[PDB]
Design an enzyme around this catalytic site. Sequence first.
Site, PDB file in Angstrom:
ATOM      1  N   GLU A   1       8.419   5.617  -2.752  1.00  0.00           N
ATOM      2  CA  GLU A   1       9.090   5.061  -3.910  1.00  0.00           C
ATOM      3  C   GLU A   1       9.905   3.849  -3.488  1.00  0.00           C
ATOM      4  O   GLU A   1      10.268   3.766  -2.311  1.00  0.00           O
ATOM      5  CB  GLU A   1      10.048   6.074  -4.485  1.00  0.00           C
ATOM      6  CG  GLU A   1       9.408   6.819  -5.631  1.00  0.00           C
ATOM      7  CD  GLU A   1      10.375   7.761  -6.312  1.00  0.00           C
ATOM      8  OE1 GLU A   1       9.980   8.365  -7.333  1.00  0.00           O
ATOM      9  OE2 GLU A   1      11.519   7.882  -5.797  1.00  0.00           O
TER      10      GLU A   1
ATOM     11  N   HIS B   1      -7.994  -1.264  -3.758  1.00  0.00           N
ATOM     12  CA  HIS B   1      -6.631  -1.142  -4.210  1.00  0.00           C
ATOM     13  C   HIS B   1      -6.300  -2.351  -5.080  1.00  0.00           C
ATOM     14  O   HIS B   1      -5.750  -2.205  -6.191  1.00  0.00           O
ATOM     15  CB  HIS B   1      -5.710  -0.941  -3.001  1.00  0.00           C
ATOM     16  CG  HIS B   1      -5.996   0.313  -2.245  1.00  0.00           C
ATOM     17  ND1 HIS B   1      -5.850   1.581  -2.789  1.00  0.00           N
ATOM     18  CD2 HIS B   1      -6.437   0.505  -0.992  1.00  0.00           C
ATOM     19  CE1 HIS B   1      -6.171   2.502  -1.899  1.00  0.00           C
ATOM     20  NE2 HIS B   1      -6.516   1.869  -0.784  1.00  0.00           N
TER      21      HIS B   1
ATOM     22  N   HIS C   1       0.827  -1.201   0.000  1.00  0.00           N
ATOM     23  CA  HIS C   1       0.000   0.000   0.000  1.00  0.00           C
ATOM     24  C   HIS C   1       0.871   1.264   0.000  1.00  0.00           C
ATOM     25  O   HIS C   1       0.660   2.177  -0.794  1.00  0.00           O
ATOM     26  CB  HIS C   1      -0.952  -0.036   1.195  1.00  0.00           C
ATOM     27  CG  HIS C   1      -2.002   1.030   1.204  1.00  0.00           C
ATOM     28  ND1 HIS C   1      -1.711   2.386   1.175  1.00  0.00           N
ATOM     29  CD2 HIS C   1      -3.347   0.957   1.310  1.00  0.00           C
ATOM     30  CE1 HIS C   1      -2.825   3.084   1.178  1.00  0.00           C
ATOM     31  NE2 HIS C   1      -3.846   2.240   1.285  1.00  0.00           N
TER      32      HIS C   1
END
Lengths: 118, 119
Positions: free
Chosen positions: A45, A75, A9
């Site tokens: 990232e 998601h 996530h």
Amino acid sequence: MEALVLVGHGSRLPYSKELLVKLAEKVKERNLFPIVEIGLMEFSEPTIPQAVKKAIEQGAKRIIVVPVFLAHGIHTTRDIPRLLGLIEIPEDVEIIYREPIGADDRIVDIIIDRAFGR
Amino acid sequence: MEALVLVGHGSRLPYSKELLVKLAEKVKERNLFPIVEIGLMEFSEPTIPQAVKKAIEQGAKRIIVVPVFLAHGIHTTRDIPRLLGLIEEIPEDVEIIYREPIGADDRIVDIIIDRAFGR
């Protein structure tokens, strides 16, 4: 020839990315996959597209994407299949979108250990 | 005397609540806890306060709350400790024991490999 991309996530705290990183190092330790990359959906990232590109450019043509999520939801069913364009990958390359963790007996084991502060 | 309360995120889809429910039933099957309840942080019912009160009113005075979340974050460190009033509805003669999330456990590595292979 194939790569494992672990996908998580992401968080504004660091804990989420730490976890994906520990999981990827642990899976690296088992020597099952030539290439192993991680990607995070939001905030952090590398991003899912970045992880996929890294895998392609190390010479993989079969990308196994595992969503490290407990359950399906927005998601896993919308955002991620979207980011993978399953709804910038070469012809000669297939993404294999796998299944989340779900109600696995091992997570029952983990929950009882947590119950007892182990 | 003690109760397990499993706590999960909650979802606008049904998958999240289904999972907590399956987990609770699987824990029920192992016969370790006199009382086992589930609570969802957002969207779904039962809610975390509801789960805790249900446990108390079955006669538990130590509530073991396990967050069924992969990692720590806003939910586990802020929202949930808040909803449990562990920070800043619970009587005395009753303690909440707020446990630890799942984290990078070897068994999760095992599960991820199984998923990698479509098992």
